Amino acid sequence: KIDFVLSVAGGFVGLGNVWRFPYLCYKNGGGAFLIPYFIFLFGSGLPVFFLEIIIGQYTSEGGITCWEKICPLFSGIGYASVVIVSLLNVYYIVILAWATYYLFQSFQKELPWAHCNHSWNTPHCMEDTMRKNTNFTSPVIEFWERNVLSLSPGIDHPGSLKWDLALCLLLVWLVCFFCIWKGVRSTGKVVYFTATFPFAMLLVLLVRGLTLPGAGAGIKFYLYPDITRLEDPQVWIDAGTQIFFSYAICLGAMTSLGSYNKYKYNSYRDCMLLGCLNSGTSFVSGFAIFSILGFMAQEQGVDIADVAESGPGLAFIAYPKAVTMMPLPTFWSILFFIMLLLLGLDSQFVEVEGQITSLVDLYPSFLRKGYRREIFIAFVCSISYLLGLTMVTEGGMYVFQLFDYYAASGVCLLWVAFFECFVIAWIYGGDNLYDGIEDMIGYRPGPWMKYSWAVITPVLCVGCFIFSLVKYVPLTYNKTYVYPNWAIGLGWSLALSSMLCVPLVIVIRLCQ
Ligand SMILES: *[C@@H]1O[C@H](CO)[C@@H](O)[C@H](O)[C@H]1NC(C)=O
Ligand SMILES: *[C@@H]1O[C@H](CO)[C@@H](O)[C@H](O)[C@H]1NC(C)=O
Ligand SMILES: *[C@@H]1O[C@H](CO)[C@@H](O)[C@H](O)[C@H]1NC(C)=O
Ligand SMILES: [Cl-]
């Protein structure tokens, strides 16, 4: 029953809640992030999640073709989701590549980031333990910034392609290809492990984090807000994307997950449970990582807002620092990186299988099992690897950060979600959906969610977008570097490559 549904949904938590949420909550202050986080959650997250589940269940088609009989004129939501999930597959596998590199470098007796007496460290390096005794730098951040991937002075100098990371990325892609070769999703007792290990790892990390000194400052920074920061659109614009990324909203996956359920199945309670559980695990992981970050700041004796990198690498700077202090660091490090690989992989298979099925639905005659689908999967993996080689070279962090900020976040996700809510609440109508639910499942849901879809989400999205446009600021990596105009143009081209799908399909349909 409930144990079975939690066993099925154990794959809900992924690299999102464990990695992306911390650095998004850290880039622009922690306390000023929770208020728009929860506002956007209860305004759009659970509403749009439930909406995707209902559309996938009511209509047997799940994905691109769900909108074919709801509103054909707005069919571009599926294409936008396909483009967004393709870019997501492009830049998501790099996190797994870094995790694999750490796993391979963690088999040694002494962890590489324990000390910085190595051949890739400047003399200015100092051990953070002895730091309290404007040019010093902790060993972990220096290691992550040079040995893991060397940083050029800017994006204008791509440098030379790295080889060890390329090999790790190729290994991960080959593992994914050879696992989709057969398919190991159908599991018996293994689903118990695949659902218990991540939670146990997170729980022991939580215990370690809040049992460490200096966690109080991290908790206060995470919770206590700053009203003045709400005056900048960055906090709202990234709080309206982190919660959408966590639930895989608008990625075309949740609109097809509900297609497996039958007509008479109470999906309301399941959707509420998964949403609340995802929010809770994200919140507790935030406590853990901000506690370890506060401990890092306490030993480093520097301001919390700049103690660590304010970019995609926050997890790889906090979590290894946490497992370093745990007894027998090698064992816990190996287990943790296996956990990261398991979660990120499972997300990678769902993101990929969804994309492949969605694109095959476009041309069903081209690929009907056999070997043509096999070579198509091989081609997709090869092209994704080649494209991902761009952000793994020397100074590859800038391309990755820009592509993450402008690919599956920022304005594209809010754009897709706003049109989704607008069409569902202004052509199909919330009353019609409640009538269908009432005649479909037991109990009539409260009128809260129809008002939600009608007002709370579209107003929030439009206001955030316009408020960002008026107070336009360039995207900056970390806090001391500024992109050139052409880099921002490239990022905006990336975002438009997703956003323009809806107007393009609209005008094509209006032509005939
Ligand atoms: C050299 O590396 C060892 C290994 O951790 C370390 O204990 C020692 O402090 C380092 N010495 C210098 C001068 O970096
Ligand atoms: C600072 O360095 C000196 C020199 O080794 C050492 O004696 C002292 O214990 C250090 N201070 C702390 C707080 O460890
Ligand atoms: C250290 O940082 C300061 C700025 O705070 C800078 O003026 C100085 O050149 C840097 N290097 C050294 C060796 O002090
Ligand atoms: Cl989240």
From Swiss-Prot:
Changing residue 32 to E: In HTRDC; severely decreased taurine transport activity in patient cells; does not affect cell membrane localization. The chain crosses the membrane at residues 4-24, 32-51, 76-96, 163-181, 190-207, 243-260, 272-293, 326-345, 375-393, 410-430, 451-470, 490-508. It comes from the Eukaryota. Expressed abundantly in placenta and skeletal muscle, at intermediate levels in heart, brain, lung, kidney and pancreas and at low levels in liver. GO terms for molecular function: alanine transmembrane transporter activity; amino acid transmembrane transporter activity; amino acid:sodium symporter activity; gamma-aminobutyric acid transmembrane transporter activity; gamma-aminobutyric acid:sodium:chloride symporter activity; taurine transmembrane transporter activity; taurine:sodium symporter activity. The keyword Membrane applies. The keyword Transmembrane helix applies. Taurine transport activity is down-regulated upon Ser-267 phosphorylation. It is found in: Cell membrane. The modification Phosphoserine is found at residue 267. Keywords: Cardiomyopathy, Cell membrane, Disease variant, Glycoprotein, Membrane, Neurotransmitter transport, Phosphoprotein, Symport, Transmembrane, Transmembrane helix, Transport. Residues 97-162 are extracellular. GO terms for cellular component: apical plasma membrane; basolateral plasma membrane; cell projection; dendrite; GABA-ergic synapse; membrane; microvillus membrane; neuronal cell body. Taurine transport activity is stimulated by thyrotropin. Taurine transport activity is inhibited by GABA, hypotaurine and beta-alanine. It is linked to Hypotaurinemic retinal degeneration and cardiomyopathy: An autosomal recessive disorder characterized by low plasma taurine, childhood-onset progressive retinal degeneration, and cardiomyopathy. Belongs to the sodium:neurotransmitter symporter (SNF) (TC 2.A.22) family. SLC6A6 subfamily. Mediates sodium- and chloride-dependent transport of taurine. Mediates transport of beta-alanine. Can also mediate transport of hypotaurine and gamma-aminobutyric acid (GABA). This is Sodium- and chloride-dependent taurine transporter. The gene is SLC6A6. The chain holds residues 47 to 567 of 620 of the full protein.
